[PDB]
Design a binder for these strands. Sequence first.
RNA 1: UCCUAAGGUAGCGAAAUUCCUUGUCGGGUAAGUUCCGACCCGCACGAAAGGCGUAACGAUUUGGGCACUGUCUCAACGAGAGACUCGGUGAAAUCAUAGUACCUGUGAAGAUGCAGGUUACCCGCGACAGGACGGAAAGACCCCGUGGAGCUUUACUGUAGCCUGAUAUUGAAAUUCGGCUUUCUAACCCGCACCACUUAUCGUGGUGGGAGACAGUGUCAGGCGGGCAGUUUGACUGGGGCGGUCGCCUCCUAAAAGGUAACGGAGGCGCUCAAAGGUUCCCUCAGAAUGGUUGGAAAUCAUUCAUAGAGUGUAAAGGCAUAAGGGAGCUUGACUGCGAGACCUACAAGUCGAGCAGGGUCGAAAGACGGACUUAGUGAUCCGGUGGUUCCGCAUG
RNA 2: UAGGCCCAAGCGACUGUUUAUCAAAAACACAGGUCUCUGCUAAACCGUAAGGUGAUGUAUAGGGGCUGACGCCUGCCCGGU
RNA 3: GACAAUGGUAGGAGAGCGUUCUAAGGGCGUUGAAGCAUGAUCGUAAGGACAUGUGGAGCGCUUAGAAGUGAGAAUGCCGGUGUGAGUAGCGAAAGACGGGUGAGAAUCCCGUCCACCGAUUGACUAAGGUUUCCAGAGGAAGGCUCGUCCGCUCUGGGUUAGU
RNA 4: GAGGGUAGCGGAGAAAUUCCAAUCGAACCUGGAGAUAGCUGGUUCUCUCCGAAAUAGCUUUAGGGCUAGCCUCAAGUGAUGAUUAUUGGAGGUAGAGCACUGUUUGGACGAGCGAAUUCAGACAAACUCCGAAUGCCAAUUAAUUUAACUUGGGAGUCAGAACAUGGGUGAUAAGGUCCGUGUUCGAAAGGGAAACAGCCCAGACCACCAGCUAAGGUCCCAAAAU
RNA 5: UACAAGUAGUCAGAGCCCGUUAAUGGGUGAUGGCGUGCCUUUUGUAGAAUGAACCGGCGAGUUACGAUUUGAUGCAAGGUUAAGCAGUAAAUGUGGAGCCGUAGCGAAAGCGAGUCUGAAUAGGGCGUUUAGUAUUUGGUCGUAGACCCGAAACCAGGUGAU
Lengths: 64, 78, 49
Amino acid sequence: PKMKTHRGAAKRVKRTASGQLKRSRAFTSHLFANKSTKQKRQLRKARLVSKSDMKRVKQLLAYK
Amino acid sequence: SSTKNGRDSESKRLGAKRADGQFVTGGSILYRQRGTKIYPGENVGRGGDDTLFAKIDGVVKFERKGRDKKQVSVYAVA
Amino acid sequence: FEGGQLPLFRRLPKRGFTNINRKEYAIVNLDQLNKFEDGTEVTPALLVE
RNA sequence: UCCUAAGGUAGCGAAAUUCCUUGUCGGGUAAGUUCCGACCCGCACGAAAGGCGUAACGAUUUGGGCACUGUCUCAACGAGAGACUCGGUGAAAUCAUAGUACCUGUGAAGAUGCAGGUUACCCGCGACAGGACGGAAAGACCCCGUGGAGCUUUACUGUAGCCUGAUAUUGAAAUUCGGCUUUCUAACCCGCACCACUUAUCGUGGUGGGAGACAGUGUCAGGCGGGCAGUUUGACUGGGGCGGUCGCCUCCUAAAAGGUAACGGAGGCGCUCAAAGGUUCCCUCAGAAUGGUUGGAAAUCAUUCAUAGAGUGUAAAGGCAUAAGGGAGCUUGACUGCGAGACCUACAAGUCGAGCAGGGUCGAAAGACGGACUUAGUGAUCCGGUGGUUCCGCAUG
RNA sequence: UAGGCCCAAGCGACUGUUUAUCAAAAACACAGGUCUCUGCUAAACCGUAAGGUGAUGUAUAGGGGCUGACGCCUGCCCGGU
RNA sequence: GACAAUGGUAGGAGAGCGUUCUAAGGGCGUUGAAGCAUGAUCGUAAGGACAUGUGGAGCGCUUAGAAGUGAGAAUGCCGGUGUGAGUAGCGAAAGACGGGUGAGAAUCCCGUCCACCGAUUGACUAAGGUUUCCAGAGGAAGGCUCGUCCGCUCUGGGUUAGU
RNA sequence: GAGGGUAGCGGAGAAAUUCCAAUCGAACCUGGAGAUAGCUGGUUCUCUCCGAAAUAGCUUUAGGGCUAGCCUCAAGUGAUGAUUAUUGGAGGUAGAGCACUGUUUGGACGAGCGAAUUCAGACAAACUCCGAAUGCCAAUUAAUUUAACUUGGGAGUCAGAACAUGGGUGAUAAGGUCCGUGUUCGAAAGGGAAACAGCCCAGACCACCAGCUAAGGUCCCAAAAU
RNA sequence: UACAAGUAGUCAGAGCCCGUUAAUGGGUGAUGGCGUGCCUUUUGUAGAAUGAACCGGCGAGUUACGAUUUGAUGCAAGGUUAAGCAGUAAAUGUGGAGCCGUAGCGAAAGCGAGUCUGAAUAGGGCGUUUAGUAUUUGGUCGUAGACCCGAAACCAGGUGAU
């Protein structure tokens, strides 16, 4: 039948204009006294899913 | 019996990342080191950990800081 | 993935929410209006037709 | 003298129990690791998972005698059935094709088939068992699988039953302070008697006794619960078990770029500092010799030589005397929004960074300042707590 | 056709029972001893409802645990469960 | 024409052979189709023809389409047939001779002698089996050999209760 | 002996995991059901071109996976690829040496003096006053050659072995084990080493009763010099 | 073919017997040289590691619905039908609900060839390619047993004390 979509993946990425995926950053939940000021400033900027990971989870997000 | 050894740390990768007479940009790393093994020359800075980086664009030259001392410089050639 | 280490979509956090009262508009550019002759009335009843 | 709730009594003891051990002595035999009788230095006997004995009993386990014998020195002969020849009938396991020798070598390290040599005319029948790693059984021993099943418990999560309280069935009167306790009968109960359906006491109804708002039952709550049920019980490893280890930092092995393993050789870390941070000024250590109220001519006074042997908070390496080492004044840059370019890298992560804007500290000024001479002091996501906010908030505020 | 006998030692008292098809024994049972529960719609067990066993029995009677003819006996400890 | 290249496991890419069915077109066949056997034939391969024997009624060729489309291994499934091999065995035991039957007799009938059991291999009956009981015929298969014989085949018969 | 009772989350047991239709640590039949198997076995026609890996990281992971490395097909950019010749440079190995930290031999030096001072002679992976041959990074520099890079479709591989060389470990043992650097096998037939995957020479498109050579050889087996 | 040491073949070769799809022909074989079956699994197998006695037949990547990529074809800032109705269970007309694309950014309000962060396009991230779309051959993936054969076990309903 119809192919199902990974609901957990749909809550973490968004598709860009050229078909790429825009993701968020990790290591930002708590324990902020153990990280430098420069580290925390640069962890607030979004990134892109790498090409190595894209080849593995491309079928998961096909309706997105 | 048993042993008390077997521990180690991940190998940090230091050395010279640029060659003599090679064109570099305005933020290229020229040398990674602990302490001072090569001094900063002209148009060369120092970081938190002792590392040498270029400030302008040009060639890379390793020179002699007198006796048993060394420096690297960047010259704005072309 | 199966077994192994933690999957990529498990070590990243969720972001944002969605709006129930979201409005989306159909966009028509100025260049697309050159079809109609000058000095005429344009209505949403005419753009669709 | 120390500790504990008290430190084994009577009996027995190289024992169905003693590793050392064939303990030591005596007896039995020509010769006795077995046997019997004693000793007590009981690794690790012991008083109802009883101790020490005991007539009769035992297809029970041990040691020694008489008689007897082919069990043996050491084998021999005879009878019958099979076997052997002829007539009738007539299977099976196994099977890659086969014209299928030995010795010394070679080989996946033990050859009918490979190399060199030596033996051997072709085809049958009766015998033996060295090989064909000979034939039946996809090794029950050992290990592996995030494979099963039975059993145990102070492993985890549940449960059948059992105990306790609140409430409904549940009524009627009185005592000091929404109740405790004591009385009564109509609810309810009796595998309690008599009568009838009925020649049946299973059942039902009636009449008398007993108990009584108790008990029994329904819903909710707390406790006990291997009686029972479903599952978990890690990896590396010169096989597995045991011992040891698992993340991070600094040296050697490591073969002068970077990288590089072993249950290889050495050590640390899970912090600290409100000045041990920033800036501006000033200064140069350790060690040795001599002299005076002699404590290490180095507990302080003074002089000379002395490029580092001293310090740098904490292991090590690399650095530092332009000091990064010691002293003083002022101060909080241990700020905010960023960030061209680069190193490392499977990913997620990690490192450095000139410059731009908004407030500032020290300095006459040029200038320096986004923690500490550098490199360890750290943990994704999910979920939850606190402070702020032009954000959303299911007809509308 | 029809018992071989004798002298000593370990275990179990005995007659009995047991792994159909590799173990018949020192293993199980046994009479005796002891502790504990039960006042009768008894305790205990099946079903966990009716209905039954116990028992058409009544503490010299029933269920359970441990030892196991007979003789001599069976010591100390109530911290822990 | 001139030069250059062409060993290969896992695996990637391309061009092809053959079988069954369908559409269209065009053919063969009792003066002999498919199938089966033989031959000294053709192409770089899977493969394609021709002739002769048997056979007795259907079958190729071209271009397209579709798929139950290709067999040496799975201690594979079903059927047939070999090797062991004229080998092991033929299931407790005493038979000898005379006369008949017969195509065929150690094994079938009749007579004599010898032999074995006799708290049983003798005589009844319960369970269970269900015609194996009787007579006359037969010898393919069953009888661990033979058989003129039989608990085996054919045709007919047989079980009688007031106790 | 006959007639009956107890049924598998269960019965019966003078108790052995003993029996319940030749089977019992949980009977037999039919269904869920084509249960699950990261494990063994098997997988059917033919030719042409190209052609591996047995590695790193993580892993309830170690004989299983994922990403990266290496192979193949198509479409793109266009000297960006490799080897030499000449300069520049970073980096302390072999060797050597005692100026530092440690070890050590024999003489002068009283404060016991083979080390608190001095003269000769030695040792070191965790010593260095010094320091090669190779290898490595670049020039935007010259001759020769044919490859490199980017984006997309499809994979396999994660058990390696021997020989030469520098080491650790063991015993300056192993056809032992773990690393670096080459060749071959794996996936390579042909010749030599008697036979003998890894040693030496050399890489098979097909056919010929043609010539010259390599490794190793020329008395006979057995081709070539008694 | 009865002096001979054999994975049974191949290359060379006298002798003897025949005559074809008529071609530098067929059958047999005294002697000489070379030569240790096939498959699977392995670093490595003649292996004394597994499998098959022999012959014949049967015996294993398929289909449905979605995604992506490559080729072909029709239209082109547009492309295109679904259910239903008519029609021979027929391939053709009607049917414009719907879907994709032409415009992105931001968690969102919202803005818009420019948006978000930010006091500030000051810098930075993602966009301004702004040519797709319907069907189908081939390759791969997902959901269904999904290349085939093979368990020790679990649950439910019944049959058994000859």
